[PDB]
Design a protein around this motif. Structure first.
Motif, PDB file in Angstrom:
ATOM      1  N   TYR A 108      33.381  37.859  23.650  1.00 27.93           N
ATOM      2  CA  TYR A 108      33.393  39.291  23.907  1.00 27.93           C
ATOM      3  C   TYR A 108      33.999  39.581  25.276  1.00 27.93           C
ATOM      4  O   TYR A 108      34.307  38.675  26.054  1.00 27.93           O
ATOM      5  N   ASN A 109      34.179  40.868  25.561  1.00 24.31           N
ATOM      6  CA  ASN A 109      34.685  41.328  26.846  1.00 24.31           C
ATOM      7  C   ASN A 109      33.708  42.335  27.431  1.00 24.31           C
ATOM      8  O   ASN A 109      33.210  43.211  26.717  1.00 24.31           O
ATOM      9  N   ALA A 110      33.429  42.203  28.725  1.00 28.90           N
ATOM     10  CA  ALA A 110      32.554  43.132  29.424  1.00 28.90           C
ATOM     11  C   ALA A 110      33.045  43.287  30.855  1.00 28.90           C
ATOM     12  O   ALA A 110      33.458  42.316  31.494  1.00 28.90           O
ATOM     13  N   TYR A 111      32.993  44.521  31.355  1.00 28.86           N
ATOM     14  CA  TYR A 111      33.492  44.830  32.686  1.00 28.86           C
ATOM     15  C   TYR A 111      32.474  45.697  33.410  1.00 28.86           C
ATOM     16  O   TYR A 111      31.663  46.381  32.787  1.00 28.86           O
ATOM     17  N   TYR A 112      32.522  45.670  34.740  1.00 31.29           N
ATOM     18  CA  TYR A 112      31.609  46.461  35.555  1.00 31.29           C
ATOM     19  C   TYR A 112      32.365  47.063  36.727  1.00 31.29           C
ATOM     20  O   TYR A 112      33.047  46.344  37.462  1.00 31.29           O
ATOM     21  N   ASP A 113      32.248  48.378  36.900  1.00 36.11           N
ATOM     22  CA  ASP A 113      32.833  49.067  38.040  1.00 36.11           C
ATOM     23  C   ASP A 113      31.731  49.393  39.040  1.00 36.11           C
ATOM     24  O   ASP A 113      30.757  50.075  38.700  1.00 36.11           O
ATOM     25  N   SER A 114      31.886  48.907  40.271  1.00 32.11           N
ATOM     26  CA  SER A 114      30.865  49.058  41.299  1.00 32.11           C
ATOM     27  C   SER A 114      30.997  50.361  42.078  1.00 32.11           C
ATOM     28  O   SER A 114      30.060  50.747  42.783  1.00 32.11           O
ATOM     29  N   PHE A 134      31.505  48.891  31.465  1.00 32.06           N
ATOM     30  CA  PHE A 134      32.412  49.445  30.474  1.00 32.06           C
ATOM     31  C   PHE A 134      33.109  48.330  29.708  1.00 32.06           C
ATOM     32  O   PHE A 134      33.325  47.223  30.217  1.00 32.06           O
ATOM     33  N   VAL A 135      33.430  48.644  28.453  1.00 34.97           N
ATOM     34  CA  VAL A 135      34.129  47.746  27.534  1.00 34.97           C
ATOM     35  C   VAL A 135      35.155  48.565  26.759  1.00 34.97           C
ATOM     36  O   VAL A 135      34.865  49.682  26.323  1.00 34.97           O
ATOM     37  N   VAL A 136      36.351  48.012  26.578  1.00 33.67           N
ATOM     38  CA  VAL A 136      37.420  48.684  25.844  1.00 33.67           C
ATOM     39  C   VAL A 136      37.524  48.072  24.453  1.00 33.67           C
ATOM     40  O   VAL A 136      37.557  46.844  24.304  1.00 33.67           O
ATOM     41  N   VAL A 137      37.574  48.927  23.431  1.00 30.11           N
ATOM     42  CA  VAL A 137      37.696  48.506  22.040  1.00 30.11           C
ATOM     43  C   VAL A 137      38.920  49.175  21.430  1.00 30.11           C
ATOM     44  O   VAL A 137      39.132  50.381  21.603  1.00 30.11           O
ATOM     45  N   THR A 189      44.264  46.889  16.065  1.00 32.72           N
ATOM     46  CA  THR A 189      42.944  46.971  15.454  1.00 32.72           C
ATOM     47  C   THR A 189      42.180  45.661  15.585  1.00 32.72           C
ATOM     48  O   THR A 189      41.009  45.664  15.975  1.00 32.72           O
ATOM     49  N   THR A 190      42.824  44.537  15.267  1.00 27.18           N
ATOM     50  CA  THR A 190      42.214  43.223  15.417  1.00 27.18           C
ATOM     51  C   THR A 190      42.893  42.373  16.482  1.00 27.18           C
ATOM     52  O   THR A 190      42.438  41.254  16.747  1.00 27.18           O
ATOM     53  N   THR A 191      43.963  42.870  17.094  1.00 30.28           N
ATOM     54  CA  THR A 191      44.706  42.131  18.104  1.00 30.28           C
ATOM     55  C   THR A 191      44.413  42.707  19.483  1.00 30.28           C
ATOM     56  O   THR A 191      44.514  43.919  19.698  1.00 30.28           O
ATOM     57  N   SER A 192      44.050  41.829  20.412  1.00 32.94           N
ATOM     58  CA  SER A 192      43.739  42.246  21.770  1.00 32.94           C
ATOM     59  C   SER A 192      44.992  42.744  22.479  1.00 32.94           C
ATOM     60  O   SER A 192      46.087  42.201  22.307  1.00 32.94           O
ATOM     61  N   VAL A 193      44.818  43.789  23.286  1.00 31.48           N
ATOM     62  CA  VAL A 193      45.910  44.388  24.042  1.00 31.48           C
ATOM     63  C   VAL A 193      45.464  44.521  25.492  1.00 31.48           C
ATOM     64  O   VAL A 193      44.271  44.616  25.790  1.00 31.48           O
ATOM     65  N   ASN A 194      46.436  44.511  26.399  1.00 31.03           N
ATOM     66  CA  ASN A 194      46.168  44.641  27.823  1.00 31.03           C
ATOM     67  C   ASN A 194      46.220  46.105  28.235  1.00 31.03           C
ATOM     68  O   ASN A 194      47.211  46.799  27.992  1.00 31.03           O
ATOM     69  N   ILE A 195      45.145  46.567  28.860  1.00 30.97           N
ATOM     70  CA  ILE A 195      44.989  47.945  29.309  1.00 30.97           C
ATOM     71  C   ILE A 195      45.356  47.998  30.787  1.00 30.97           C
ATOM     72  O   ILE A 195      44.713  47.323  31.604  1.00 30.97           O
TER      73      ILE A 195
END
Lengths: 51, 51
Positions: B7-13, B19-22, B29-35
């Protein structure tokens, strides 16, 4: 004089004014904030707008 | 539910939120992309100050 990481450095590195973090915002100050440009043009700024 | 592995998980201090991007709609839809950071900063300004 000592520096960070416990290392004695022979020259001083100035902390940039634009890198300071706002206390009431929690973010680093912008690059277009009025006091920064005022400092960057102090001569003409104080001469013209008397601020 | 989000997975516990892969999984992916992020935190803004600065905005101090986790926050997590889906990706849902076409094409990603099933392929990860760079934000990019600069465009996600529109909805969360804190990512501009603290990574």
């Amino acid at each position: 004089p000592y520096d960070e990481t416990g290392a004695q450095v022979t020259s001083v590195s100035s902390t940039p004014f634009g890198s300071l973090i706002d206390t009431s915002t929690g973010q680093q100050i912008l690059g277009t904030n009025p006091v920064l440009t005022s400092y960057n043009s102090y001569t003409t700024q104080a001469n013209t707008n008397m601020q | 539910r989000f997975p516990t592995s892969g999984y992916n998980a992020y935190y803004d201090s600065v905005d101090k939120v986790v926050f997590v991007v889906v990706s849902f709609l076409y094409p990603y839809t099933t392929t990860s992309v760079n934000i990019p950071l600069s465009y996600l900063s529109k909805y969360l300004p804190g990512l501009l100050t603290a990574q």
